[PDB]
């Protein structure tokens, strides 16, 4: 009831396109301090990826005795794997403030002062060179993404993101995994069905038992790609140059990662079409 | 001492240009509590003008049980106001950092990045604007003075410093008082004994035997207004003009303290060589 629960971490990391590797450390006997740090390790990037807006507090996971693994923020118990992907989406959400457009609205160092996102670019540099903490406003950055800019003591950080829902992101790796099936009516009546209903509906109406009580364990379902920040340190975190590339380098991973989390899910998708 | 512990620290205030008026407060129909807030508000305004140099501490003074004033640094006593101004002037001693020209090297802020104290105006500007907490190095200033600013909060604060030890304003204020002498005689027998053994030297000399006893008792003797911090909140304090506004503000507040408890002190060697 709590078993498989590294592979259930490993699940949820990878939504994020973090290879978490939890289960290979515990299965070479790592000691549970490394098995902790690892866990934190991998939520803290996924945090990074998720988009859901929560840089302002500090993300943990840990091992329990009873085999469990708790992810807290700031410290409060927040959530248990066990407890399913549904029921962690559902924890964090109240601690979210998402915007029109899905970016969000929190402050990454918190309350106080933000810069705005399309300062000119001599003066956000005096910004990166000589401020102690400091934080922009979402910006445009290019090709409908968003980005921003902040500096927590010795690190910067570099955010790019482009919203895109969970559900919408299933719906098209099930546009993808149908498309690979018979020419046949189970498709005509799931496109007649999409010009009436989403796509968990028309392939939950249209399929046999269990395509909803399997697929409510999906953590796709709760979590996607929308964003990605790239960290510099050091003399690096105080040079505009550096900052500039690392922009460039967040914009390109954005990309891969969305493609490879796409690509992972087709797959598992059509894994589900061949076990039928 | 001398008639009380509130003259006491009156007193001590005086040296820094603070008309605090504890022994009124304590004579009055004041609340209970209104006691101890005065004195730590009269204190924080006496360590922006000491020019100490200890902006990072937590400044408070209090009264004790039985009936003395204590006054701490992040919380920790210091010392107590009955034990003399020599006293207190030596526990603040091993916290200072003085480099050559008598400037704090302690950072208001902190351990971190400071900014560089000639940056061009422009670029200072993006700091007062859009930074967080921030602060510069010291730099020149007009008229002799030196200058630094920071941002904690919601305030950003203004230094102008022109350093001079306590003895230095004392010999200012014996060479003012062997100025006005209108007996010339005394005035030639000081004037060698100065050739010689300096001013002060000479005009301590002059007096009753013991003249470097009972005015080293006097708080002149260890504090003196070097300093002078201006204040801006709000809007004010992210705005460039209103900067170099609160330079000049601060430049005249610390000429007219200087000028000030010159005067007083030339009063002070006054009323004990006279009436010889």
Redesign the interface.
Known sequence: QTDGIYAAFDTLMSTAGVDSQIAALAASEADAGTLDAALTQSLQEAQGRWGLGLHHLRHEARLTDDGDIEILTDGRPSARVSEGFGALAQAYAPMQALDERGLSQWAA?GE??R?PGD?PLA?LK??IE??????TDWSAGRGETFQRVWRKGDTLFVEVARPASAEAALSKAAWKVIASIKDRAFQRELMRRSEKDGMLGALLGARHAGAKANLAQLPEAHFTVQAFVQTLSGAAA?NAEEYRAALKTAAAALEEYQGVTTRQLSEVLRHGLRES
């Open positions: 160092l106080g002062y810069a300062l003066q005096v910004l000589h401020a102690r903490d400091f934080e105080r």
